[PDB]
């Protein structure tokens, strides 16, 4: 017995809020580095910090938490991800003063714990609570949460925090109007998932979660599944392109305000608008993706087409940025963002086909893990490479990155079609 429930649109709605209230406390702190530098009186290392402990946290708990959520449920994660959420957000709050910086990457952590019960949730939730023609819709429209939660983050810090270096009493006064809104905010989502997010409909929505439902898998030995994966060489090697792309972002993302304020001084506001163009425009280039693959291109075509685009645009993106106009900015960052972030739902994409009968939890649980540990390997690299020569020798070093990624993209052996 099949049917579906009106509380999918509620559970989808309630998730896709606070994953977007989540990635907007990952990147908060790196698109106003300078205004929290000078506030809390520390170096730029130490803002670019709470943007790693989100990548740091994530690969050794990814998979002691894909665990609990196989044996105590769906609820008890949604309730666990939005409650750190809130409690992370209010401990930022009490941090306003300027030797409390401690205090804040406390509550960065409390968030970066929080990620874990929440990047991989978008693909458990769309099956257990959606029919069969809506999975996809409903993966994507929660993935794609996150990154409006990203670009949100882009935005709306700039405006909220004016550079008012000067006169402190007010940049404490904007900095808790931004904490306090934001845990406001995650409050209310987390209220929300204790009354509204349930474990499971009353009636499985599709026939392979009926199946589900009357076969329990019970244990799964992740260590065995994660060394049946190791030996797959087209894996590997797609698990190392993925985090290298993903990385970059990662790495643009916290490091994007630098860039810009090295030559556009005062340009934190446009340096906002221009993170939410190049997340807008990859979110737009996630949803025409699949118009991409046609019907007789494969998954690995697209790929390495999509690869290439997106390194021309970082080197595109690297040398128009010294040419002192901020217009073009807007243009190659869009550029950028259209392949480099339109790329990350296209590699989760791929990595069915080339595993097939392992899980997709811990296929996704490995992807993600690969992008954190580049994230932090690139966003520590170009960070020291910016601090001591400028933006261009770490934004050469992410093209040469992107272009070894170029080259083991054309390796892997795997053709499927959509
Ligand atoms: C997924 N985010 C982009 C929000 C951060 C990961 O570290």
Request: one cysteine or more; proline letters at 5%.
């Given at each position: 017995?099949?049917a579906?429930?009106?509380?999918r649109?509620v559970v989808?709605?309630?998730?896709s809020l606070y994953?977007?209230?989540?990635?907007f406390?990952?990147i908060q702190y790196?698109?106003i580095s300078n205004?929290?530098?000078?506030?809390?009186?520390?170096?730029l290392?130490?803002?670019?910090w709470?943007?790693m402990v989100?990548?740091?946290?994530?690969?050794?708990?990814?998979?002691?938490?894909?665990?609990?959520?196989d044996?105590?449920?769906?609820?008890?994660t949604?309730l666990?991800?939005?409650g750190?959420?809130?409690?992370?957000?209010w401990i930022?709050?009490?941090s306003?003063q300027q030797?409390?910086?401690?205090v804040?990457?406390?509550?960065?952590?409390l968030?970066?714990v929080?990620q874990?019960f929440?990047?991989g949730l978008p693909?458990?939730?769309?099956?257990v609570?959606?029919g069969?023609?809506?999975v996809?819709?409903?993966?994507?429209?929660?993935?794609l949460?996150?990154?409006?939660g990203?670009?949100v983050?882009?935005?709306?810090?700039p405006?909220?925090?004016?550079?008012?270096?000067?006169?402190?009493?007010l940049?404490?006064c904007?900095?808790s109007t931004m904490?306090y809104?934001?845990?406001?905010?995650?409050?209310?989502l987390?209220?929300?998932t204790?009354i509204?997010?349930?474990?499971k409909?009353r009636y499985?929505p599709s026939?392979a979660?009926?199946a589900?439902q009357d076969?329990?898998?019970?244990?799964?030995?992740?260590?065995?599944?994660?060394?049946?994966?190791?030996?797959?060489?087209?894996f590997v090697?797609?698990l190392?392109?993925?985090?290298?792309?993903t990385?970059?972002f990662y790495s643009?993302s916290?490091?994007?305000?630098?860039?810009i304020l090295?030559?556009?001084?005062?340009?934190?506001?446009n340096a906002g608008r221009?993170?939410?163009?190049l997340?807008?425009?990859?979110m737009v280039?996630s949803?025409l993706c699949?118009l991409?693959?046609?019907?007789?291109?494969?998954?690995?075509?697209?790929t390495?087409?999509?690869?290439?685009?997106?390194?021309?645009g970082?080197?595109?993106?690297?040398f128009?940025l010294?040419?002192r106009?901020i217009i073009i900015?807007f243009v190659?960052?869009g550029?950028?963002?259209?392949?480099?972030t339109?790329?990350l739902?296209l590699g989760?994409?791929?990595?069915?086909?080339?595993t097939?009968?392992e899980s997709?939890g811990?296929?996704s649980?490995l992807?993600?893990?690969?992008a954190?540990?580049?994230?932090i390997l690139?966003?520590?690299?170009?960070?020291?490479?910016?601090?001591?020569?400028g933006?261009?020798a770490g934004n050469?070093?992410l093209?040469?990155?992107?272009?070894?990624?170029?080259?083991?993209t054309?390796?892997?052996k795997?053709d499927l079609?959509?």
């Open positions: 017995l099949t579906l429930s009106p509380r649109f989808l709605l309630i998730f994953s977007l209230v989540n990635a406390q990952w790196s698109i205004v929290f530098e000078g506030f809390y009186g520390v170096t290392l130490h803002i670019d709470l943007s989100y990548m740091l946290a994530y690969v050794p708990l990814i998979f002691p938490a894909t665990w609990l959520l044996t105590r449920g769906l609820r008890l949604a666990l991800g939005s750190l959420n809130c409690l992370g957000a930022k709050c009490g306003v030797h409390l910086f401690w804040t990457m406390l509550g960065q952590c968030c970066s929080a874990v929440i990047l693909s458990r939730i769309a099956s609570w959606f069969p023609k809506e996809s819709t409903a993966c994507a429209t929660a993935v949460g996150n990154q409006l990203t670009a983050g882009f935005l709306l810090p405006v909220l925090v004016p550079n008012t270096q000067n006169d402190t009493n940049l404490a904007n900095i904490f809104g934001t845990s406001a905010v995650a409050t209310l987390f209220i929300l204790a509204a997010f349930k474990e409909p499985p026939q979660q009926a589900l076969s329990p898998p019970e244990e799964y030995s992740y260590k065995k599944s994660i060394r049946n994966l190791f030996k797959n060489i087209p090697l797609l190392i392109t993925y985090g290298i792309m990385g970059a643009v916290t490091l994007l305000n630098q860039m090295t030559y556009y001084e005062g340009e934190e506001v221009i993170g939410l163009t997340v807008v425009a990859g280039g949803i699949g991409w693959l046609d019907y007789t291109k494969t998954y690995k075509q697209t390495l087409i999509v690869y290439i685009l997106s390194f021309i970082m080197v595109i993106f690297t128009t010294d040419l106009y900015v190659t960052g550029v950028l963002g259209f392949f480099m339109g790329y739902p989760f994409e791929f990595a069915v086909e080339i097939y009968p997709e811990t296929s649980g992807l993600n893990a690969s954190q540990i580049f994230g690139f966003t520590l690299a170009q960070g020291k490479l910016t601090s001591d020569y933006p261009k050469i070093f093209c040469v990155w992107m272009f070894i990624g170029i080259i083991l054309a390796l892997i795997s079609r959509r």
